[PDB]
Amino acid sequence: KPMDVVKLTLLLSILTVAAKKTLTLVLDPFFWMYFSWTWLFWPWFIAVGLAGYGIYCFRKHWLGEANAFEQLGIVTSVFTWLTLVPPAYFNGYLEGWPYVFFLAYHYFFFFNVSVRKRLYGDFYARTHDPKWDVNTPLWSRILFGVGIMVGHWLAAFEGPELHRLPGGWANVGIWILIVITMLMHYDSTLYLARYSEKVVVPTAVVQFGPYRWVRHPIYASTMLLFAAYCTALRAPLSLLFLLAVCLVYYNKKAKMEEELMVESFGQSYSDYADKVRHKFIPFVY
């Protein structure tokens, strides 16, 4: 047909002019020189494009067709802009804490994923009772998230300049505190998951390990790694604001979950709570 010839000639002409533009751009000296001028600003471009890729994958996951790679990508983007970026912009350079705590977050997110591949067939959601999962109004969730970021960025900014923090024997505290929070979180998750049949359907009351020191050790361990990042950069006020916002939201969510298991288990969780009152901090809260 002649129309095929006409459209092929049109495509050839468009390809010819596009390749002419491409060839005169490739051999252009000023284009390459300005390319090298904008080569100066490379680490901030990946840090911002990962935000776009993350929000795209996050909208897809909100729709519900996200592969596990996109979910871990959202996790990685959050961990990069919460533990790699705050001292990459407010100091201009990374050395010391940010890489360690960025990998520490990736290490700390990976127990509910690791345990639920080991003591399961896969990550496939088992059919369960709809009132078992704790749900909270979305404005409260985003308020908690915003407060957490405000605390972390405030620790980054109020904290001093990067390479001036000391070393030697003063950097053993973050080591032991991080070991403690990982150990206590792992114990809490293991003791919570070794009894439940489904994803969150407990059968008996857990009163072993950190549960005999505190009523909510998972939340307090997340709290303690928050404090660990904030203490690695030696900023008390942002630690206090982080403590305030996490106390508010975690206490709200702990109150709903506590009244749920009080209603569901009867006297058992009541005597468990009488044995250990302190909800978040040992003999402080």
Q: Which of 223, 230, 213 is nearest to 283 (CA)?
A: 213
Q: Which range of residues in 58-66, 86-94, 149-157, 231-239 is near ligand PX2 by CB under 6 A?
A: 86-94
Residue 84 binds ligand PX2 (CB under 6 A)? yes
- 43 contact choice in ligand PX2, another protein, none (CB below 5 to 8 Å, kind-dependent): ligand PX2
Phi/psi for 69 (5° steps) reads: -60, -40
- 135 contact choice in another protein, ligand PX2, none (CB below 5 to 8 Å, kind-dependent): none
Residue closer to ligand PX2, measured from CB, 82 or 220? 82
Alpha-carbon distance values, 118 to 115, 186, 199 (Å)? 5, 14, 13
What is the smallest separation between the CB atom of 220 and another protein, expressed in angstroms?
19
Residue closer to another protein, measured from CB, 79 or 249? 79
- 163 contact choice in another protein, ligand PX2, none (CB below 5 to 8 Å, kind-dependent): none
Query: Is residue 216 exposed (0-12), middle (13-18) or buried (19+ Cβ within 10 Å)?
Result: buried
Q: Which range of residues in 69-77, 86-94, 106-114, 229-237 is near another protein by CB under 8 A?
A: 106-114
Helix axes 97-109, 68-83, angle to 10 degrees: 150
User: DSSP string covering 82-136, please?
Assistant: HHTSHHHHSSS---SHHHHHHHHHHHHHTTTTTHHHHTSSSSPPPP--TTTS---
Residue 192 one-letter amino acid: L
Residue 92 binds ligand PX2 (CB under 6 A)? yes
- 115 contact choice in another protein, ligand PX2, none (CB below 5 to 8 Å, kind-dependent): another protein
Tokens of 149: 């970021």
Q: Which range of residues in 41-49, 65-73, 75-83, 105-113 is near another protein by CB under 8 A?
A: 105-113
CA-CA distance, 86 to 148, in Å (whole number)?
13
Residue from 34, 44, 195, 208 in contact with ligand PX2 (CB under 6 A)? 44
CA 213 to the chain's CA centroid: 26
Residue closer to another protein, measured from CB, 75 or 262? 75
- 109 contact choice in ligand PX2, another protein, none (CB below 5 to 8 Å, kind-dependent): none
User: For residues 115 and 193, is the Cβ–Cβ distance under 8 A?
Assistant: yes
Binding-residue total with ligand PX2 (CB under 6 A): 11
What is the smallest separation between the CB atom of 70 and another protein, expressed in angstroms?
23
Residue 114 binds another protein (CB under 8 A)? yes
Determine how many CB atoms are found less than 10 A away from the CB of residue 187: 17
CA-CA distance, 243 to 230, in Å (whole number)?
11
What is the smallest separation between the CB atom of 114 and another protein, expressed in angstroms?
6
Tokens of 25: 């751009």
Residue 115 binds another protein (CB under 8 A)? yes
Residues constituting the chain: 285
Where along the sequence are the contacts to ligand PX2 (CB under 6 A)? Answer: 43-44, 46-47, 84-85, 88-89, 92-94
> Which residues of this chain interact with another protein, rule CB under 8 A?
107, 110-111, 114-115, 118, 183, 186
